[PDB]
């Protein structure tokens, strides 16, 4: 690996230790290539807080040189992670608060606790899946049989997507976030999801119920309505991230308390909490990697640094809780004990901040304890070292997870 000031991320995702590893030396500012496309990388925790409450960093894609330019276009593998439309996502400014409100009055805790009925049944009935799966000492697919499906469920249930078209959703998302998905057939994905979601606010439109859908459709009499636009484009958001993240977060918790059995210990002891053994897992091994993408309305003086009018900065939310002026010499060790557990910025910082980190924390809080309560000798079945990471270069997606239920 000949030195290089341009870190190329590998979408293979072959070495993420090494290349998290290498984007914190390089930092806090460093620069990387995103399949031929350079941006600026975000890799320190507290230039990162800094940056995500600055106004001259914007998330509308016109403001992207390279977009103005037309040297990146909708060929580029990654677009679809920014070019969409109108939402909570790609807004700032003062517009930005009519976006989130619905949704963050929604997924307070307390309007949680309505939902947590819908999760406890889920996760029962993934559990009963999976007994059945591991019968008589069967290697299961931790992931396709439990983990995979919940968060589906749940954020489906909560928008209102019918159980019979998740199916659909998923296979969707898996091409949209595959780096193998070749280039025409991931724009169509795109298309026919945006169709799909089109529809559902139609049908919603048509027949409200007791969702978040419906309550962004219509809301409290007063307004000003959300467009059609911005309706379906929270609706998408929502689902997205409300699945993806959420897989890996249960995931990656299990994982991390299998490979370190005290600590799965202490939290089954009650000496320290499930929660806190959450909290530690988003700072060490979180759902995010990257997130394209924000851009210069002009230039950014940062003292001996400057971030050009037009340049792209991604946040390396990965290298950002491997951090180790705010979390010691220790960062790369999973400790749930430590004193910066809670100290992360895994589901970010400023106006753009999670809305539905509630929500991912109380579904991961009644999963995991569930699972293990359950099947209190669940070992892997293969060395927990070799599972590899599906080639999705934003997003820390396992690929598999092979478990017995033990005994
Ligand atoms: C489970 C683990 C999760 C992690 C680690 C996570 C992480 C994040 C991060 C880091 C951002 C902001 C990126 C940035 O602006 O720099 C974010 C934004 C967002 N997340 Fe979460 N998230 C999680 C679960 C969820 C869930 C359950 C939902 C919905 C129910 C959700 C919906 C959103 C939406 C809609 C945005 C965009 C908000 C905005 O831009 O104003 N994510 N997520
Ligand atoms: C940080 C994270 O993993 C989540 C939070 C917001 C999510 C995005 C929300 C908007 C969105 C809509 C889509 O239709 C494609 C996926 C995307 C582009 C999502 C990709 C994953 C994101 C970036
Ligand atoms: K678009
Ligand atoms: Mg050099």
Known sequence: CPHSDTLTIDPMITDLAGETSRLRAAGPLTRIDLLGVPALAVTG???????????????????????????????????????????????????????????????????????????????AELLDDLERAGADGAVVDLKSVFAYPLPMRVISALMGVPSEDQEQLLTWYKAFFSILTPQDERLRVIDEMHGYFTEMVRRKTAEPGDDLTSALIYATDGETPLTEEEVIGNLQALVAAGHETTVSLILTAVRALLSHPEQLRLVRDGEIGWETAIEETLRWDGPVIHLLMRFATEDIDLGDAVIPRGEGVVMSYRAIGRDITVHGADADDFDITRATAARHISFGHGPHICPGAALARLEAAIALPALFTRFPHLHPALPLDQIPNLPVLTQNDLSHFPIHLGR
């Open 45 to 123: 925790h507290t230039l990162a807080r800094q940056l995500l409450t600055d106004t001259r960093l914007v998330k509308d894609i016109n403001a992207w040189s390279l977009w103005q330019s037309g040297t990146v276009t909708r060929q580029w593998p990654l677009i679809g992670m920014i070019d969409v439309d109108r939402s909570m996502f790609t807004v700032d400014g003062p517009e930005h608060r009519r976006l989130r409100i619905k949704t963050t009055q929604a997924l307070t805790r307390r309007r949680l606790d309505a939902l947590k009925p819908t999760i406890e049944r889920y996760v």
